[PDB]
Design a protein around this ligand. Structure first.
Ligand SMILES: [Cl-]
Ligand SMILES: [Cl-]
Ligand SMILES: [Cl-]
Ligand SMILES: [Cl-]
Ligand code: NA
Ligand SMILES: [Zn+2]
Ligand SMILES: [Zn+2]
Lengths: 53, 146
């Protein structure tokens, strides 16, 4: 969305930058969010405590 | 008029080339990933592909990434991140350079070593200056090994 920074835990409004599409507030939130998604993607392919989500 | 990069869908599209921990499996997969990285201009795509390289540990796969042009590509990303003063991406790029098994012949290809040496002296970020300093000392030992 465009109302707040897409990184989980960040409520800041997004800023304009040629490096993204008005959904991040800073460069740090880009790297941190991509790291959060990567870890969750690895967790989704590893052992789970439930069969279906 | 735009489309925000979905890093989850980027990794999903590489499901067959990566392990459960996000490591590149074969040298054929790192060639297709490099083709996607060469066309990646948005920061989300670049930071996601850098995580894939950082997680890959097989040396024969990492050397293939360097041979296909990955070292030239990281030089272009390093140059752009230094011009726009993108500290988080500069940090992740230097962590990737330290992760890659760079040889003396690789360091002589472009001015990446020069830009890293300048960061170790004049960067106002404490963590970026320290990472660049450790990276230069590691490369000094590689040159000293022959
Ligand atoms: Cl930032
Ligand atoms: Cl949109
Ligand atoms: Cl892109
Ligand atoms: Cl560029
Ligand atoms: Na080069
Ligand atoms: Zn944010
Ligand atoms: Zn939009």
């Amino acid at each position: 969305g465009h109302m707040r920074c897409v990184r989980s835990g960040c409520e800041n409004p997004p800023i304009v930058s040629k490096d993204w599409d008005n959904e991040y507030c800073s460069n740090e939130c880009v790297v941190k969010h991509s790291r959060d998604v990567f870890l969750a993607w690895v967790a989704s392919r590893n052992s789970n405590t439930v069969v279906f989500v | 008029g735009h489309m925000p990069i979905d890093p989850k869908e980027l990794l999903k599209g590489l499901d067959s080339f990566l392990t459960r921990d996000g490591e590149v499996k074969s040298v054929d997969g790192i060639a297709k990933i490099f083709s996607l990285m060469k066309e990646a201009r948005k920061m989300v795509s670049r930071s996601t592909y850098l995580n894939i390289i950082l997680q890959t540990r097989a040396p024969e796969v990492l050397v293939k990434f360097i041979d296909v042009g990955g070292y030239k590509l990281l030089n272009s990303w390093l140059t752009y991140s230094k011009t726009t003063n993108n500290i988080p991406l500069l940090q992740q790029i230097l962590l990737t350079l330290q992760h890659l098994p760079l040889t003396v012949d690789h360091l002589k290809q472009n001015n990446t070593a020069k830009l890293v040496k300048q960061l170790s002296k004049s960067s106002e970020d404490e963590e970026l200056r320290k990472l660049a300093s450790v990276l230069v000392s590691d490369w000094m030992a590689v040159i000293r090994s022959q």
